[PDB]
């Protein structure tokens, strides 16, 4: 890369209720769009989890009078984004939190690995994408951790062979979503990941929610020793462990939530609570663009480095990131020589000054400008093959 990553997860299910289409991305703020998620079978077969969202949906300019086999849905919409934003690379993300059960099996044999790599890369070269993100949540033991490395080396090796025939000189990106929890990351082959991958998207959030006994900061930088119940986890320990484990700092992209976690029937941060309540689309999770709510006031834990909102009238607290938090996390990641910012996820962001991804872009300054690929001469989609010309 020739500068900081400013990367955002784009969810293919975001096109429905959330009505967030690839054209809605503020592409000028983004170095990498990570397209989420592909599903996975136990025999390593990577599959579309939604073929309509992925390549069948016709947008206002998608004609049914097109000759040949053509890609539509988000695939064509993201290729349009790639054409208008040559510094924007699009990565295919496989698995995610709900679709990781088949990873151990998928990685367990040379045959399954070879099948995973081949089917993954097929979608990538057919859809006109710049690389593959593997979001296996998570390797549970030494066998799975070793096999994850064997899987990534199979994918790297097949990407390079694909490039050598159909995109000579182009470097396809290989990335992972990485856990911030020591229970999880202590099992990874960190030094192997640091060697084989372009980026580790550190998922430095989901520290506290319905799964927590007490209200907690969702994505704090540091431990609060004068209120440790408020910081069950901290990003700093995770980042240091990844670097000292042998992931080069510059390959670590700091993940940041574009949503908050709500706590109801609670006194405050570090305190006892009863239920997360309602959410934006799902119980106890609020889109950052729905935050802070009318009435609630944003307090800042300056030790933990984590903002939250509390309604003293309704006793609701919501851990979420503000623009100011983004500026602090960017100052932080630049201090440790990290590779940039990652966001989960695009649909929940505000527009203008108050955009978390926008704020990250200005804070980082010199974004990665490495050129994307528009040449897919082996795509089974004529429109992709012809670069939508
Ligand atoms: C990089 C990585 O590991 N990512 C972590 C994420 O896994 C995690 O984000 C959560 O991701 C899960 C999927 O893994 C996602 O689950 C989705 O839930 C939504 C419901 O909100 C479903 O959306 C519906 O889909 C149907 C059709 O499929 C639509 O018709 C309907 O309109 C949708 N409903 C709404 C309201 O939009 C998705 O189907 C489902 N996806 C899958 C594949 O199961 C969670 O929503 C994500 N959670 C959050 C908080 O965003 C993330 C944060 O915890 O951490 C990532 O880094
Ligand atoms: C820091 C840590 O390990 N916390 C765990 C949480 O990560 C985890 O929540 C889940 O974490 C994933 C991010 O790494 C998300 O993809 C996923 O959406 C999220 N699960 C939920 C509840 O949204 C919880 C599991 O309940 O465990 C913590 O220990
Ligand atoms: Zn709906
Ligand atoms: Zn059609
Ligand atoms: Zn290379
Ligand atoms: Zn590389
Ligand atoms: Zn810029």
UniProtKB/Swiss-Prot annotation:
Q: What class of enzyme is it?
A: hydrolase
Its biotechnological use is: The antagonistic activity of Trichoderma harzianum is used for the control of several soil borne plant pathogenic fungi.
Sites binding chitin sit at: 68-69, 95-98, 138, 203-206, 344
Give the highest taxon in the source lineage. Answer: Eukaryota
> GO CC annotations?
extracellular region
What is a biological process (GO) this protein takes part in? chitin catabolic process
Name the Enzyme Commission number(s) assigned to this protein: 3.2.1.14
Locations listed in the record: Secreted
Q: Note the Pfam families from the entry.
A: Glyco_hydro_18
This entry's comment on induction and repression of expression is: Specifically induced by chitin and is catabolite repressed.
Keywords carried by this UniProt record:
Carbohydrate metabolism, Chitin degradation, Chitin-binding, Cleavage on pair of basic residues, Glycoprotein, Glycosidase, Hydrolase, Polysaccharide degradation, Secreted, Signal, Zymogen
Entry note: thermal dependence: Optimum temperature is 45-50 degrees Celsius.
Where's the GH18 domain? 4-367
Q: Where is the active site?
A: 137
Q: Which residues are glycosylated?
A: 184
Q: What does this protein do?
A: Secreted chitinase involved in the degradation of chitin, a component of the cell walls of fungi and exoskeletal elements of some animals (including worms and arthropods). Plays a morphogenetic role during apical growth, cell division and differentiation (cell wall morphogenesis). Also acts as an antifungal agent. Involved in the degradation and further assimilation of phytopathogenic fungi, namely mycoparasitism, the major mechanism accounting for the antagonistic activity against phytopathogenic fungi displayed by Trichoderma.
Full protein name? Endochitinase 42
Q: What is the lineage of its organism?
A: Eukaryota, Fungi, Dikarya, Ascomycota, Pezizomycotina
């Amino acid at each position: 890369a020739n500068g900081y990553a400013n990367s955002v997860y784009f969810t293919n299910w975001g096109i429905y209720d959330r009505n967030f289409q690839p054209a809605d991305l503020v592409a000028s703020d983004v170095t990498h769009v990570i397209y989420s998620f592909m599903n996975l079978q136990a025999d390593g077969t990577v599959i579309s989890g939604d073929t309509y969202a992925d390549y069948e949906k016709h947008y206002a300019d998608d004609s049914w009078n097109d000759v040949g086999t053509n890609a539509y849905g988000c695939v064509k919409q993201l290729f349009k984004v790639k054409k208008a934003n040559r510094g924007l690379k699009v990565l295919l993300s496989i698995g995610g939190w709900t679709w990781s059960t088949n990873f151990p099996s998928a990685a367990s044999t040379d045959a399954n690995r070879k099948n995973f790599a081949k089917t993954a890369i097929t979608f990538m070269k057919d859809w006109g994408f710049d690389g593959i993100d593997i979001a296996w949540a998570y390797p549970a033991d030494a066998t799975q951790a070793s096999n994850m490395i064997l899987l990534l080396k199979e994918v790297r090796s097949q990407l390079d062979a694909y490039a050598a025939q159909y995109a000579p000189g182009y470097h396809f990106l290989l990335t992972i979503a990485a856990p911030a929890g020591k229970d999880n990351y202590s099992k990874l082959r960190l030094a192997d990941l640091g060697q084989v991958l372009d980026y580790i998207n550190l998922m430095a959030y989901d520290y506290a929610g319905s799964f927590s006994p007490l209200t907690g900061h969702d994505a704090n930088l540091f431990n609060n020793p004068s209120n440790p119940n408020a910081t069950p986890f901290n990003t700093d320990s995770a980042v240091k462990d990844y670097i000292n484990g042998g992931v080069p700092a510059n390959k670590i992209v700091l993940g940041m939530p574009i949503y908050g976690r709500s706590f109801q029937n609670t006194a405050g941060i570090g305190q006892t609570y009863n239920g997360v309540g309602s959410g934006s689309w799902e119980a106890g999770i609020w889109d950052y663009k729905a935050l802070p709510k009318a009435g609630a006031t944003v307090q800042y834990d300056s030790v933990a480095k984590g903002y939250y909102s509390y309604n003293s009238a309704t006793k609701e607290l919501i851990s979420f990131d503000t623009p100011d938090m983004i500026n602090t996390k960017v100052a932080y990641l630049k201090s440790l020589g990290l590779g940039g910012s990652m966001f989960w996820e695009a649909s929940a962001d505000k527009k203008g000054a108050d955009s978390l991804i926008g704020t990250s872009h200005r804070a980082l300054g010199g974004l990665d400008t490495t050129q994307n690929l528009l040449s897919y001469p082996n795509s089974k989609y004529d429109n992709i093959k012809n670069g939508l010309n």
